[PDB]
Scaffold this active site. Structure first.
Site, PDB file in Angstrom:
ATOM      1  N   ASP A 290       0.827  -1.201   0.000  1.00 25.58           N
ATOM      2  CA  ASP A 290       0.000   0.000   0.000  1.00 25.58           C
ATOM      3  C   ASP A 290       0.863   1.255   0.000  1.00 25.58           C
ATOM      4  OD1 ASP A 290      -2.691  -1.069  -0.129  1.00 25.58           O
ATOM      5  OD2 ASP A 290      -2.398  -1.838   1.900  1.00 25.58           O
ATOM      6  N   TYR A 374      -9.965  -1.213   2.054  1.00 25.39           N
ATOM      7  CA  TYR A 374      -9.318  -1.074   3.357  1.00 25.39           C
ATOM      8  C   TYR A 374      -9.201   0.360   3.844  1.00 25.39           C
TER       9      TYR A 374
END
Ligand SMILES: [Cu+2]
Length: 620
Positions: A290, A374
């Site tokens: 990420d 997320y």
């Protein structure tokens, strides 16, 4: 006036003009990364030189560049072409995300796959996911995304409740062509909705919660000067912001009487990896970095007063660059406040008759990022007693799949026909240490059990041992919760009043590290995640544990390559890299939206002070 000040909108415009005037930012160019560089090592560094590092993407297919510019000179300092097949692709651009769904909507293989499931193409969302490096030779040197499909029954429907299993496509987003469409068979699309604002699912909301009001009638006890320099209860630091790393902490120091004592020179979460543990071909390639691939800073939320941050909140609004070099402001992107933390110290002494109680406090610096399904909160805490803590809060919606008839060893069931594959969320903290200055060393501390015998006749004694890590090749460490293993960072040249080296102790949570097979692709690209602790000799260009270009890089870059230099770390300018993470076996209670789960670490003083540093806290 400080060289650690946040980048301003004017500095970013200046970078844009400089790149333009130099011919580097034409109409076909896109900024994929832009951030300020840290001042180089210089104890008398006087002449300020605000330099910026830029990754320039070329939508025409030309080779991308890494560029360094001096806004403090109006000049380009360096410009290098990159061979991305060798050193990795640039981070994903936000405008590439939507291209995956639109390209696929006119592809004959995709539509055939949807028609066989009686799915309406205008209702199929495609999650654009990073590609990784696997067995497809045609992908090398090209910028690839992979796509998984989810059904949205109506515009406000949660698509995660309706995964389309058995189907995955690969897309070249520069040449805009679909390279492959793989269809391993049809699975029913799970039918139940996961709409957590729908009253039919929530039932009537509770009326039992009464308000909690947290106020500071005289305002907060910390002061902000120069935009981002903090002073609070003897602590001193600068809050930086990078589009890749997010919140960065600079120059963490503590005022011990007359002198300001450095503790940490730079602290950041330098990488984050989410590996999936489902062996199905539809998903076995799934791992997102990420931080390295998407840049968590650019997806920071605006934090709403009273919902995201409660109390007397001070906000920072960092500025980043969009794809063309214009300044973008993240309004209310960083929350800072102080909060009560229970009892600090307490004793009622029978012999003296004195009753003593003091309350603890912590300073909180946080931001929150959203990447697809997320949501991650990043929290740094500073306590009265000299403790530093980091906490990650993971929430959002779990990534879904079909739940196979007959069960699975790598997926849990959340709802009729609906599964959630096992995965991990693993972080790397980069701690550029400066314990009382820059000559530091790391020792590993284990509990030592002793055998009953002479000198230990009652068999009660126990001890500890400390092993100095002297060379990088011996500074790749793993946890051992059973022997209470911790690591101490000390300064051998700075002693406390007992003539002992001053230090700080690192307390890990001892959660499992990367579970994948050590021969796997992800074990090579995320080698840092296989060990709990690494120590390196500081260098300007060793910034990330995976290297500079994570997207589709073949592996090995970063920490394993740094460590091989075998440099001296016994009393030197050192950097600690701590791996820590959550192993997520999803549960029914995670669905349809998941309660926060947490992981982290802390550092406590270990003979750094000459006595308790909170003797001067008042009673209140
Ligand atoms: Cu998870």
């Amino acid at each position: 006036a400080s060289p650690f000040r946040l980048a301003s909108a004017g500095e970013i415009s200046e970078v844009q003009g400089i790149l333009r005037t130099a011919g580097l930012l034409g109409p076909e160019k896109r900024i994929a990364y832009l951030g300020v560089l840290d001042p180089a090592r210089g104890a008398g560094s006087e002449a300020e030189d605000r330099r910026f590092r830029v990754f320039i993407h070329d939508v025409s297919g030309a080779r991308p560049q890494e560029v360094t510019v001096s806004v403090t000179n109006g000049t380009v300092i360096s410009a290098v072409e990159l061979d991305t097949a060798a050193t990795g692709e640039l981070p994903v651009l936000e405008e590439e995300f939507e291209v995956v769904e639109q390209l696929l909507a006119t592809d004959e293989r995709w539509l055939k796959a949807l028609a066989a499931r009686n799915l309406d193409v205008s209702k199929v969302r495609v999650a654009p996911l990073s590609a990784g490096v696997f067995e497809y030779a045609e992908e090398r040197g090209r910028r690839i995304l992979r796509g998984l499909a989810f059904v949205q029954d109506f515009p406000e429907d949660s698509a995660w409740a309706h995964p389309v299993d058995g189907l995955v496509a690969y897309v070249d987003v520069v040449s805009k062509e679909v390279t492959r469409v793989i269809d391993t068979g049809v699975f029913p699309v799970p039918a139940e909705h996961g709409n957590y604002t729908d009253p039919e699912l929530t039932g009537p909301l509770r009326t039992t919660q009464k308000p909690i009001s947290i106020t500071q009638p005289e305002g907060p006890s910390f002061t902000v000067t120069g935009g981002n320099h903090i002073e609070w209860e003897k602590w001193s630091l600068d809050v930086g912001f990078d589009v890749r790393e997010g919140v960065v902490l600079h120059n963490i120091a503590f005022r011990d009487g007359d002198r300001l004592r450095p503790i940490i020179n730079r602290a950041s979460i330098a990488e984050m990896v989410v590996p999936y543990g489902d062996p199905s071909p539809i998903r076995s390639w799934q791992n997102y970095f990420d931080t390295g691939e998407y840049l968590v800073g650019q997806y920071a939320n605006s934090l709403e007063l009273g919902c995201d941050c409660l109390g007397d909140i001070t906000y920072l609004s960092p500025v980043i660059s969009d794809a063309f070099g214009n300044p973008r402001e993240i309004r209310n992107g960083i929350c800072m406040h102080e909060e009560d933390w229970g009892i600090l110290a307490k004793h009622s002494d029978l012999w003296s008759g004195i009753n003593y109680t003091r309350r603890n406090r912590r300073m909180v610096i946080s931001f929150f990022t959203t990447i697809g399904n997320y949501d991650y909160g990043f929290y740094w805490y500073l306590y009265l007693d000299g403790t530093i803590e980091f906490e990650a809060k993971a929430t959002g919606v779990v990534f879904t799949s079909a739940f196979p008839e007959g069960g699975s060893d790598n997926i849990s069931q959340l709802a009729p026909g609906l599964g959630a594959p096992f995965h991990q969320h693993i972080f790397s903290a980069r701690l550029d240490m400066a314990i009382d200055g820059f000559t530091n060393r790391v020792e590993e501390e284990d509990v030592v059990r002793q055998t009953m015998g002479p000198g230990n006749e009652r068999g009660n004694a126990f001890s500890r041992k400390r092993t100095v890590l002297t060379r990088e090749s011996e500074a790749v460490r793993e946890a051992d919760a059973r022997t209470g293993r911790t690591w101490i960072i000390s300064n051998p040249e700075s002693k406390n009043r007992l003539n002992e080296p001053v230090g700080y102790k690192l307390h890990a949570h001892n959660q499992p590290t990367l579970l994948a097979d050590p021969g796997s692709s992800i074990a090579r690209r995320a080698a840092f995640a296989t060990k709990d602790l690494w120590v390196t000799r500081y260098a300007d260009d060793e910034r990330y544990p995976t290297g500079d270009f994570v997207n589709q890089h073949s592996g090995g870059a970063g920490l394993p390559s740094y460590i091989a230099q075998d440099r001296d770390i016994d009393g030197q300018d050192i950097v600690v890299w701590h791996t820590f993470g959550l192993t997520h076996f999803p549960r029914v209670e995670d669905w349809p939206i998941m309660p926060v789960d947490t992981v982290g670490f802390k550092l406590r003083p270990e003979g750094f002070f000459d006595r308790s540093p909170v003797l001067d806290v008042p009673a209140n």
